[PDB]
């Protein structure tokens, strides 16, 4: 069940349709902000439409953030449950290292990382020990503890 749900959410993240939608909304926001920067009810309507674009973009990004949370959480739960799916460690690792800045990913990982057997990560020490740094971030406090 957990692998099913994690693979679903992952596929919903790397969807070409949704990525093109996010890119289109981003270019729209950028161009509308530039147009507002030109003029500074013309300004009134322009900034009203800019605000509507902002609301749409917040909605889309919140959807993507929820998908990211569910993906990481269910990968970690699936690794801790059975041995059927063990290349989920490589996929979880790629997904977590891409999002080392987004603190939502780090909160989910902090919550669920201590229940996975460390034998699932044992063969990925070339990639884990290459990202070690002393920065006092949460990502580093999780990575150093996992390597330890």
């Amino acid at each position: 069940v957990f692998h099913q749900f994690a693979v679903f959410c992952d596929e919903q993240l790397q969807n070409p349709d949704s990525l093109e939608d996010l890119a289109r909304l981003q270019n729209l926001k950028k161009g509308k902000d530039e147009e507002v920067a030109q003029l500074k009810s013309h300004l009134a309507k322009a900034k009203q439409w800019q605000e509507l674009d902002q609301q749409e973009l917040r909605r889309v990004e919140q959807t993507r953030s929820e998908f990211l949370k569910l993906c990481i959480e269910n990968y970690l739960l699936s690794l801790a449950a059975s041995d059927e799916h063990d290349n989920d460690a490589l996929r979880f690792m790629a997904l977590w290292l891409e999002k080392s800045e987004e603190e939502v990913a780090n909160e989910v990982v902090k919550k669920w990382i201590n229940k996975v057997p460390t034998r699932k990560f044992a063969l990925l020490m070339n990639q884990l020990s290459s990202r070690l740094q002393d920065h006092n971030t949460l990502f580093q406090k999780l990575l150093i503890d996992l390597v330890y």
Partner: protein
């Protein structure tokens, strides 16, 4: 633009004739002729015995459902909620389509009362709609409102114009 795209669509529909399944069903599109004279004028072929989809649908909606909203009332209710969040837009749209029922099935019952002719013409409608739907997806065709779609009331098929 319209003439170039009409030519492109005609060429792809000619490609459709080389395959057993689309040729067996005569899947293709109906063409017309655009002739640009200058950068500001042209001659467009008026397709013979069609009727625009909107000109049939807006009178029929009030002829068959006198208690429903008019078409202009639905248009205005949808246009007023255009600068609002998506939740309010979807709620207004559901509210409007709960008081607006389709009437297209009568186009065939009032132009073809013979069941043999009726069945053949409704099949023509469905097939030409399917072909133009796939072909216009593949080529990104847009601007598909009710004034660009004509209903041929002799053969039952749809004609798409203004393909720019």
């Amino acid at each position: 633009q319209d003439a170039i795209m009409e030519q492109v669509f005609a060429a792809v529909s000619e490609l459709l004739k080389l395959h057993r399944e689309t040729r067996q069903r005569n899947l293709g599109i109906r063409t017309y002729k655009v002739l640009p004279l200058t950068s500001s004028s042209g001659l467009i072929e008026f397709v013979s015995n069609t009727i625009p989809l909107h000109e049939y649908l807006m009178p029929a909606h009030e002829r068959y459902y006198p208690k429903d909203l008019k078409g202009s009332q639905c248009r205005k209710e949808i246009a007023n909620a255009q600068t609002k969040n998506t939740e309010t837009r979807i709620a207004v749209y559901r509210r409007v389509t709960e008081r607006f029922h389709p009437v297209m099935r009568y186009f065939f019952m009032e132009y073809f009362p013979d069941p043999d002719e009726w069945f053949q013409k409704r099949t023509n409608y469905t097939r030409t709609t399917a072909a133009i739907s796939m072909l216009g997806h593949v080529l990104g065709l847009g601007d598909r409102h009710g004034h660009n779609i004509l209903l041929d009331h002799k053969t039952g098929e749809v004609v798409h114009i203004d393909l720019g």
